[PDB]
Amino acid sequence: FPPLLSQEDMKKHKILLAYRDRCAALLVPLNECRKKNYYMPWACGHERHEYEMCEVADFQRRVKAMDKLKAEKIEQAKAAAA
Amino acid sequence: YNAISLIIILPCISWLFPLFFGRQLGYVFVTRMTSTLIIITTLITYYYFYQLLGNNNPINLELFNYLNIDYLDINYNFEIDALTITMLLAITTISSMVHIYSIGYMETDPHQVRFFSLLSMFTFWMIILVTGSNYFVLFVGWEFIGVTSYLLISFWVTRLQAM
Amino acid sequence: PVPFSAANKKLVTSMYRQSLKLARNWISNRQLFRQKAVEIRHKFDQNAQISNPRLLARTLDETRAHLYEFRHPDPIVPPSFPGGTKYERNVPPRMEKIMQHNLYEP
Amino acid sequence: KDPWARREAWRYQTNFTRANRFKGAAPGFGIAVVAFGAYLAAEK
Amino acid sequence: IRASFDKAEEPMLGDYPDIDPFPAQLKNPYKKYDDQQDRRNLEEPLSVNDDLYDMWSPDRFTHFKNQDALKYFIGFLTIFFGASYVATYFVPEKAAIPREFPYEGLWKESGGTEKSKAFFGQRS
Amino acid sequence: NYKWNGPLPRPHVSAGHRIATKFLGATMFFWMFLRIKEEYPAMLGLHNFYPP
Amino acid sequence: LFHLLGHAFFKALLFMSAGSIIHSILNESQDIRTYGGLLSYLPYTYICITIASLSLMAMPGLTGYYTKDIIIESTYGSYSISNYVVYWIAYLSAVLTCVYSMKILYLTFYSNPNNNTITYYNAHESNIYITLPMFILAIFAMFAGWILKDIYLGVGTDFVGTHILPNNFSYFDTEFSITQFYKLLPLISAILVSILIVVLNEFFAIVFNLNNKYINTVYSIFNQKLVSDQILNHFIIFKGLVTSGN
Amino acid sequence: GRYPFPKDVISMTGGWWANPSNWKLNGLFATGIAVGLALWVSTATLPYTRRREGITSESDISKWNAAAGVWRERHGKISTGEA
Amino acid sequence: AHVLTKDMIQERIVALLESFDKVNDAKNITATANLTSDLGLDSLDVVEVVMAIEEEFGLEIPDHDADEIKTVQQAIDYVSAQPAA
Amino acid sequence: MILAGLILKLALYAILRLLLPLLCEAQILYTPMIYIISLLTIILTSLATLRQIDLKVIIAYSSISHMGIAILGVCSNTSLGIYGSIVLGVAHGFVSPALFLIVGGILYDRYHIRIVNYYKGLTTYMPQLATYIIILSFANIGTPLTGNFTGEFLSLQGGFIRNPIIGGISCISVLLAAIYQLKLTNKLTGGISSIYMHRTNDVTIREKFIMNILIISTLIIGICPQIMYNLLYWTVNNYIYII
Ligand SMILES: CCCCCCCCCCCCCCCCCC(=O)OC[C@H](COP(=O)(O)OCCN)OC(=O)CCCCCCCCCCCCCCCCC
Ligand SMILES: CCCCCCCCCCCC(=O)OC[C@H](COP(=O)(O)OCC[N+](C)(C)C)OC(=O)CCCCCCCCCCC
């Protein structure tokens, strides 16, 4: 996983409100790569594959957290009746 | 050469000149005139969209003051944002293709001078609607496209259902 | 209400023109339509031999009400005609000289 | 049974018979399967 | 005569013919009129409240009775909103947590002050 | 118009029209076969990103 | 914005193909019940209108896929619960998006002819001024989504400067949380119902031509604009004119 | 169609099937006026255009924020979410 | 475009009536033939051929003008009266 | 023309000159009564325009509806409302006598009957008159770049300051002013030319002269309302009483 970018580096590279997390370190070369070409879809695919794989890892820890939420609801539902 | 201004000025030429000079130029000329002038407007805005992918740096142009009153100013301001260039390339493409299309579809109809005129003012007030840079210029284009839609749906004034 | 006569003939011919035209716009296929129209014809062939006025008027307004139930939203009109879309596009202006109203200027 | 049976035959004859009605439904399918086979074999 | 407001106009009229109001559209089109577009002969008496029975009047549909069409319209309305509102109950849960945000939910980034962290703040 | 109530002739389309049908027809089925092939795991739905 | 972009090219090709077949009939009629088969007579307007209808139903490899199916995906992918319901509603429309398009591809190109014989003698191709915009917008309505998708649908894009709130933004959530069934499902059924409406229009043609009294009332409701114009006219326009006459 | 029309009436947009005999000759004048007007208005609005981003230097904007903070401190004005 | 003539209407209506089954003969047909008497048509078969003739010319007939065309020559003159083809 | 261009604006002037300086402390207690009567004369006169058989009478009730918009900018206690009432008064004084010319000069001198039911399809014999009738129609409604919309907009904004709920139902005047005006305009402009009207002369040079002046003078105020702010910027601040 990439390190979290600094708050000042977010202010420098002008990353949008919804893109700033522990994966946005892989966003700032991508967009820059995207600015070198003219947003053409055949080009600059390696870096967007990198950013997508990082986001898949974020998605897997999101789903594992939601899985952890579902067990404690069942456990409190059984413990409140008894 | 100014890209932000020729998006505005060229469909104004393509509308004012079919009305003021339609009797003097004739249908056979005003067909190809209104056609080619919307064609070159459409080409200029593709080239501007190609420029805008290089740097996301929009261009605005400033005009005189509409109204100055106490806490409120309204200026004529025209700014091609990325949203604006998105809508703009689509409406100029559909417009220019419908101009070329209606050259041949209307060749038996009498009044196609007024028809190609009104098509061009519809495109023009659409342009001003998209590229305006306050809520006022949005309103000006917003009303006049409804005015054009009156003048366009009722093109056969003889037909009762069209009126 | 009346047996064999020209006015009863005019009524039944009008009702048959209706029932054909009415069936025409319900049905998209040719084959199912011309089958159906032959059936409709057979319904008119089974009748038209009725002697009394009572059962005649009974079946008459009963099939008028049966004709009213199967009405269609837009009848197929030819476009140059008053239901159509080509109706009154360029009606040619009648040739008129100019009437004048002022002694002094036009 | 059908009084207009000889009028309404040309609708079902030579041009609008069932094997002819589906003729230009996919005009460039046979060209594009060959060009796509060539592009499949040529990418490697 | 036929409409209710036409009956409301009746005690006002004096020495005026009080003819039956009939729509100028539901006249048949194939009879020859003086003006084909108006569907009106040259000297034909104009009704009590004419411009509702004009050619330039409303469209005046004839395939449904208006009270029935009121019922069908409100029926489709009510069945859509009832079906959607009941189908809100038969919904499945989702499989992810709603995603979180660094720097204590970007509260400094969306304006914010330490005392105003709750109004301009994200999940953390 | 030479026949009535009888079998119609095969139509005459000009040579420039019927070649442009084949070009717009060939580039449709070719481009669709390209975009199905290049995006086959994404388009159909494969290799789901839920962890096992 | 991306759907608004591709939708323009689509519908413009739809309206101009429609005007080319209205212009080519000597009658210049508009009833699809009276067009009949015109496949062998007008191959060019056919190939145009079928590129437009296949893009219109989001058949993949055309830009209707990329504009249209990802909105249906984003209804399920959103955070709020209630959005699940509009999935099905949007989904239902997509199946509906097939069926009438199949009608306006069937009854005017594939069916047995309905018009008289002379317009089938006089059916011919339109001018070069009618042909060339249809050509150019067919090419645009094929390639525009694959070209401009990187601009409007990136993993993270900085093109449009609008600012989503960080929780209303569900685009990373929507691409990954879809099961295989919910993504595979509109593709395969928008294919299948299209072939279904075709094959049921030729071979049987009685399922659609039943004469039940109840289905004819229902059909006449949906014909006359879900009786809306009547509910606008008698109860707002006409009552307004009466109270203005009062 | 080509139905007959009255020639007495004069409309500015042309009439029914307006096609004057010198339409190439008048087309020369109209292309002259259109090209000259387009070039003249495009050059006239050149100094009124400006770029959106990067017009004034960032130090000015940070100073303007500082002066905003000074003016806000003098009046004792709270933030929006402070309650 | 496409403009009809009188002989075009003639050979359309004659070929139309040659397609029809309940005629007497295909050989007694003239311009001046009565549909009711000469062709052997009922009160209701003349209506089916007025339906087919109005579909065939692409034109619509009110009920007052349909009964009047008793002979074939009246039908040819009447169909030639309208501008639509 | 002198009545509807000048006398109504004279009383719009008299509500400024005579009442707002020395009845201020009265005037605040009574702005809701003025808003009752102003909204109730915008809604109920513009709705009575729809049922009219006569043709000069429609433009008369139109003048009522526009002055009803005008006076709720005067009593708005705002800079915006006062300036909007002045620009409405001057722009209505331009646009409205042109409409009384179109009903009275070009159309009563020729046919001498003002009933609406006779007049249909004026385009096919008089194209440039129909051109006038439409561009003076749209200038009346509140379709912008004409000065009528500047008056209507700043008057509705000033009336929204002083009481928002009265401005909410005051704003539907943009709809109600369009209904009858375009309902008249499409009846005059379109259709087959009327069997009653025999064809007469095109619009003469003097009438086109009057029209061109009264339309340019709306368009200049419509494109730039600042051209007469040099007179009013004192008198926009003068009548305001915000303690
Ligand atoms: C989140 C909330 C969502 C809310 C959604 C629900 C909104 C429903 C409200 C709909 C209102 C529609 C606007 C009403 C004015 C429209 C005027 C109009 O369009 O008139 C049309 C009419 C011609 O139409 P017609 O003849 O029928 O058909 C012609 C085609 N051949 O033209 C004419 O005949 C001209 C003469 C009649 C003009 C109308 C006169 C009366 C105007 C009454 C306006 C009422 C406004 C307030 C409505 C309150 C609704 C609650
Ligand atoms: C119709 C198609 C559009 C045509 C557009 C052509 C643009 C030409 C260049 C514009 C120059 C400009 O207007 O400059 C503005 C000048 C001076 O203002 P400034 O402070 O120096 O500049 C402003 C830029 N600021 C803000 C950055 C400093 O004021 C004027 O002129 C206003 C004159 C109004 C006259 C009344 C209107 C008459 C209209 C009558 C119509 C019948």
Short mmCIF file of C-alpha atoms in Angstrom, two decimals, chain C:
data_model
loop_
_atom_site.label_atom_id
_atom_site.label_comp_id
_atom_site.label_asym_id
_atom_site.label_seq_id
_atom_site.Cartn_x
_atom_site.Cartn_y
_atom_site.Cartn_z
CA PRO C 1 -86.83 -0.34 -37.45
CA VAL C 2 -87.87 -0.97 -41.05
CA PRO C 3 -87.39 -3.86 -43.55
CA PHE C 4 -85.76 -3.78 -47.03
CA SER C 5 -85.56 -0.15 -48.21
CA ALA C 6 -83.04 2.43 -49.37
CA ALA C 7 -82.66 4.20 -46.01
CA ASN C 8 -82.11 0.94 -44.12
CA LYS C 9 -79.66 0.12 -46.92
CA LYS C 10 -77.82 3.41 -46.35
CA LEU C 11 -77.67 2.74 -42.59
CA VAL C 12 -76.34 -0.82 -42.95
CA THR C 13 -73.81 0.19 -45.63
CA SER C 14 -72.58 2.99 -43.36
CA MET C 15 -72.28 0.59 -40.41
CA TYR C 16 -70.35 -1.90 -42.56
CA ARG C 17 -67.96 0.78 -43.80
CA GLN C 18 -67.44 1.66 -40.14
CA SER C 19 -66.84 -1.91 -38.90
CA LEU C 20 -64.26 -2.51 -41.66
CA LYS C 21 -62.45 0.80 -41.02
CA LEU C 22 -62.67 0.27 -37.27
CA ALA C 23 -61.16 -3.21 -37.51
CA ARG C 24 -58.49 -1.80 -39.83
CA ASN C 25 -56.49 0.14 -37.25
CA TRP C 26 -56.65 -2.42 -34.42
CA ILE C 27 -54.83 -5.08 -36.43
CA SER C 28 -51.24 -4.74 -37.60
CA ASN C 29 -50.91 -7.97 -39.60
CA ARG C 30 -52.41 -8.37 -43.07
CA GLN C 31 -53.25 -12.05 -42.65
CA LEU C 32 -55.03 -11.81 -39.29
CA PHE C 33 -56.82 -8.73 -40.56
CA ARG C 34 -58.22 -10.30 -43.71
CA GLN C 35 -59.28 -13.37 -41.76
CA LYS C 36 -61.03 -11.09 -39.27
CA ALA C 37 -62.66 -9.07 -42.03
CA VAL C 38 -63.99 -12.29 -43.61
CA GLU C 39 -65.42 -13.23 -40.22
CA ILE C 40 -67.00 -9.76 -39.83
CA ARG C 41 -68.48 -10.30 -43.28
CA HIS C 42 -69.85 -13.67 -42.16
CA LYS C 43 -71.54 -11.94 -39.21
CA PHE C 44 -73.25 -9.63 -41.68
CA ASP C 45 -74.10 -12.60 -43.94
CA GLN C 46 -75.74 -14.58 -41.14
CA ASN C 47 -78.03 -11.58 -40.59
CA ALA C 48 -79.77 -9.40 -43.27
CA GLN C 49 -82.67 -11.84 -43.66
CA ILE C 50 -84.66 -10.65 -40.63
CA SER C 51 -88.36 -10.06 -41.23
CA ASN C 52 -89.82 -8.31 -38.17
CA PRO C 53 -88.93 -4.74 -37.15
CA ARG C 54 -88.61 -5.64 -33.45
CA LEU C 55 -85.69 -8.10 -33.48
CA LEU C 56 -84.22 -6.06 -36.34
CA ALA C 57 -84.00 -2.88 -34.26
CA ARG C 58 -82.85 -4.98 -31.28
CA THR C 59 -79.89 -6.47 -33.16
CA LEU C 60 -79.36 -3.10 -34.88
CA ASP C 61 -78.71 -1.01 -31.80
CA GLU C 62 -77.04 -4.00 -30.10
CA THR C 63 -74.42 -4.13 -32.85
CA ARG C 64 -74.26 -0.34 -32.77
CA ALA C 65 -73.28 -0.60 -29.10
CA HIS C 66 -70.93 -3.46 -29.99
CA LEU C 67 -69.49 -1.10 -32.61
CA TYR C 68 -69.08 1.60 -29.96
CA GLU C 69 -67.09 -0.60 -27.58
CA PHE C 70 -64.33 -1.20 -30.14
CA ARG C 71 -63.44 2.39 -30.88
CA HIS C 72 -59.80 3.24 -31.51
CA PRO C 73 -57.69 6.17 -30.18
CA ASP C 74 -56.26 7.44 -33.50
CA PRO C 75 -57.88 6.37 -36.77
CA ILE C 76 -55.55 5.85 -39.69
CA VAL C 77 -55.98 8.99 -41.74
CA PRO C 78 -54.19 9.87 -44.95
CA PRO C 79 -51.96 12.84 -44.16
CA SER C 80 -53.23 15.32 -46.77
CA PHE C 81 -56.73 14.97 -45.27
CA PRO C 82 -58.27 16.69 -42.21
CA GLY C 83 -57.18 14.12 -39.66
CA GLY C 84 -53.71 14.01 -41.10
CA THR C 85 -50.36 15.64 -40.60
CA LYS C 86 -49.95 17.07 -44.11
CA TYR C 87 -53.31 18.87 -43.87
CA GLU C 88 -53.00 22.63 -44.56
CA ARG C 89 -49.24 22.93 -44.90
CA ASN C 90 -49.18 25.46 -47.74
CA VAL C 91 -52.76 26.29 -48.64
CA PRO C 92 -52.28 28.57 -51.66
CA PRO C 93 -53.38 32.17 -51.14
CA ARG C 94 -56.33 33.21 -53.23
CA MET C 95 -55.52 35.74 -55.94
CA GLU C 96 -56.60 39.14 -54.66
CA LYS C 97 -55.88 42.63 -55.85
CA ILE C 98 -55.18 45.17 -53.13
CA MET C 99 -58.10 47.04 -51.62
CA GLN C 100 -57.20 50.58 -50.67
CA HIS C 101 -58.51 52.52 -47.69
CA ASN C 102 -56.69 55.88 -47.70
CA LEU C 103 -56.95 58.57 -50.36
CA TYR C 104 -53.42 59.73 -49.65
CA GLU C 105 -50.94 56.98 -48.86
CA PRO C 106 -51.04 53.20 -49.45
#
